[PDB]
């Protein structure tokens, strides 16, 4: 009857929907590759969807996906086995080389912009008149690493202007230069800011930004990847 027709139709619809959804979700990262970067023989049963194009605001261009995929950066890893499916060992210092959990993506070397075309993220000192509105103000506190040594001191908060949120702490090092630390990777305490991801000796290695009052998407990725990578790679210098 009509209910039988409804249910049968629904299942046909649902198969169609899942096919649509899976192929939509193949707009990045496909075709699949062998470990050497060449196209894999087996691409699975879903084909790539027809490309769509996103128009980016503020003259930044467009993005068309699916599109030719490439890392656009060297990857300092090598095989540890003679067959597919094993780990790839860092050929150098994985924190410096940006691989494993220290990885970064070659994102656009421009700052993310707000809806008005201004830099989305700014040091609070340059953001009129943004200020700490609740919680312990981290500015001025010593910054301790997982080796329990002081690596520097907080000199500003970098804030997301349209979303009114703390995004980074700016930390000045012993040599007077600064680095950005992701807000998600620090613990603000009463007398210090604690960073479990990095021992104090790794702070100098945090990727620097090219201009002192802005940060590009590329620079954010290198900074965040490097800091997260310390969880695995500074484990020898941590320490309860």
């Amino acid at each position: 009857d009509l209910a039988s027709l409804a249910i049968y139709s629904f299942w046909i619809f649902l198969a169609g929907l899942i096919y649509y959804l899976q192929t939509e979700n193949m707009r990045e990262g496909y075709p699949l590759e062998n470990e050497d970067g060449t196209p894999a023989a087996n691409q699975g049963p879903f084909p790539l969807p027809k490309p769509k194009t996103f128009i980016l605001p503020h003259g930044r261009g467009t993005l068309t996906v699916p599109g030719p995929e490439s890392e656009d950066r060297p990857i300092a890893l090598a095989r540890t086995a003679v067959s597919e499916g094993f780990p790839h060992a860092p050929t150098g210092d994985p924190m410096k080389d940006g691989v494993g959990p220290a990885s970064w993506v070659a994102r656009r070397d421009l700052p993310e912009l707000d809806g008005h075309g201004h830099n989305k993220i700014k040091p609070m000192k340059a953001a009129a008149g943004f200020h700490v509105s609740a919680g312990k103000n981290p500015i001025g506190l010593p910054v301790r690493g997982c080796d329990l040594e002081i690596a520097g001191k907080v000199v500003d908060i970098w804030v997301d202007i349209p979303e009114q949120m703390a995004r980074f702490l700016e930390v000045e090092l012993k040599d007077g230069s600064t680095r950005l630390l992701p807000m998600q990777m620090v613990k603000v305490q009463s007398n210090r800011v604690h960073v479990n991801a990095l021992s104090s000796d790794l702070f100098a290695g945090i990727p620097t930004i090219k201009s002192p009052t802005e940060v590009t998407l590329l620079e954010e990725d290198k900074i965040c990847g490097y800091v997260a990578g310390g969880l695995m790679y500074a484990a020898p210098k941590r320490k309860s």
């Binding site: 890392e71 890893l77 094993f86």
Partner: protein, 281 residues
């Protein structure tokens, strides 16, 4: 076999047990010690279900059902064909689920990401355990647990609920439901909002999160923001399950009468219990 961007993340390390022994992939799947454990537990579980099927004398997926020991067995063991298989399958399930969570932890550690996902999953596991382990233990028999069958588990839900009248009257169940409904509402809105920004009117530039905040302030006078919405979805879905587990752990233990009668405590308050008129006077 690899996403185009995948290789740089496939480094050694992050394992919880076994060092490098199981540090590898099979096609897309990470293995790890807990991948091996999941396979063992799942495989044994599935084999035992197929054996339970033989003893039941059916292979139909809509008919296969693995029932726990009858109430007379209390919390003891039972013959395999009479509840023992359920008991072993349940240990297998638990082993598989917990192994799955711990394998998710190894994957987090290799990827340098937060542990939020397996943390969240552990809520679902705790709800499963409330029904098959915690509640039956507190009530004193395995037989109060649900059977493993597609339709029989629904018989269990209906029979269990109607034991206490209309189960709608469980107040923890009311809260659980509210979180379920609110979660689906927020899921719809989040999905829609992001897509409406990423896919604007024809020919227009992608909108920004400023536009997402704007749309929602225009609409209801508030926007939780892009961080807040993901905090929210996580909170609503975990709260729904927390209150689901709560609503069942208190049923047949601290409250075992008709749930509708629980509400009399409010009606019977001295100040108004005896004023005429209304529904209850």
């Amino acid at each position: 076999a690899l996403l185009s961007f995948e290789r740089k993340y496939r480094v050694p390390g992050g394992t919880l047990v076994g060092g490098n022994l199981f540090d590898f992939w099979v096609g897309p799947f990470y293995v790890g010690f807990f991948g091996v454990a999941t396979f063992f537990f799942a495989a044994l579980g599935i084999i035992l279900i197929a054996w339970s099927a033989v003893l039941q004398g059916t292979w139909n997926p809509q008919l296969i059902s693995v029932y726990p020991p009858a109430l007379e067995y209390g919390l003891g063991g039972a013959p395999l064909a009479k509840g023992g298989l359920w008991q072993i399958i349940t240990i297998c399930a638990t082993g598989a689920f917990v192994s799955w969570a711990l394998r998710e932890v190894e994957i987090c550690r290799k990827l340098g990401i937060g542990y939020h996902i397996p943390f969240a999953f552990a809520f679902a596991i705790l709800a499963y355990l409330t029904l098959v382990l915690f509640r039956p233990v507190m009530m004193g028999a395995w037989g109060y647990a649900f059977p493993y069958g597609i339709w029989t588990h629904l018989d269990w839900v209906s029979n269990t609920g109607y034991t206490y009248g209309n189960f709608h009257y469980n107040p923890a169940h009311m809260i659980a439901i509210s979180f379920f409904f609110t979660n689906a509402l927020a899921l719809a809105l989040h999905g829609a909002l992001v897509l409406s920004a990423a896919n604007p009117e024809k020919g227009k530039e992608m909108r920004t999160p400023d536009h997402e905040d704007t749309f929602f302030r225009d609409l209801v006078g508030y926007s939780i923001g892009t961080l807040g919405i993901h905090r929210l979805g996580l909170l609503l879905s975990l709260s729904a399950v927390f209150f689901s587990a709560l609503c069942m752990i208190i049923t047949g233990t601290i409250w075992f009468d008709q749930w509708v009668d629980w509400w009399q405590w409010w009606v019977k308050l001295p100040w108004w219990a005896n004023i005429p008129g209304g529904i209850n006077g």
